Amino acid sequence: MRGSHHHHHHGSDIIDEFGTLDDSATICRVCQKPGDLVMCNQCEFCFHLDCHLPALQDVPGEEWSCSLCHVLPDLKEEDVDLQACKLN
Ligand SMILES: [Zn+2]
Ligand SMILES: [Zn+2]
């Protein structure tokens, strides 16, 4: 790419694309999709630290940090082939 037309600058590395998670895949479904969109790593929501409500400015890193999605799974089945315990 280069060789000696810049003589390096502040640091020496540039850092390649980092994240390999957001910036693609799922969509916000509330304001934007193909660009800037932090997802909820606790369930399956898709928003940004600025399209929640007048109160989403806590940026921990990467995306937001999920919110109050409240997705209590009442019909989820995980290898329920044999009823060992006793809960229909
Ligand atoms: Zn959004
Ligand atoms: Zn969530």
Side-chain angles (χ1 to χ4, degrees):
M1 182 160 261
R2 310 221 89 203
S4 209
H5 250 125
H6 248 328
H7 216 334
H8 300 80
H9 55 258
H10 273 267
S12 186
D13 44 78
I14 224 132
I15 282 164
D16 274 8
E17 51 249 290
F18 190 80
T20 190
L21 234 139
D22 307 297
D23 291 34
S24 55
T26 62
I27 39 277
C28 175
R29 198 115 61 194
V30 100
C31 86
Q32 252 102 240
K33 287 94 211 173
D36 301 11
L37 174 265
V38 316
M39 198 177 98
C40 121
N41 225 239
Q42 229 254 43
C43 338
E44 64 221 323
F45 229 96
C46 309
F47 52 27
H48 310 50
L49 251 139
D50 313 296
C51 102
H52 177 233
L53 39 107
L56 229 216
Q57 329 95 351
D58 63 333
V59 299
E62 301 128 332
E63 72 200 341
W64 172 350
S65 160
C66 164
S67 91
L68 39 46
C69 313
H70 251 104
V71 302
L72 282 169
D74 234 326
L75 287 157
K76 244 217 227 155
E77 80 88 55
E78 177 133 311
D79 225 355
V80 193
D81 234 312
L82 156 136
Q83 255 117 258
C85 305
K86 217 237 139 212
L87 199 293
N88 73 80

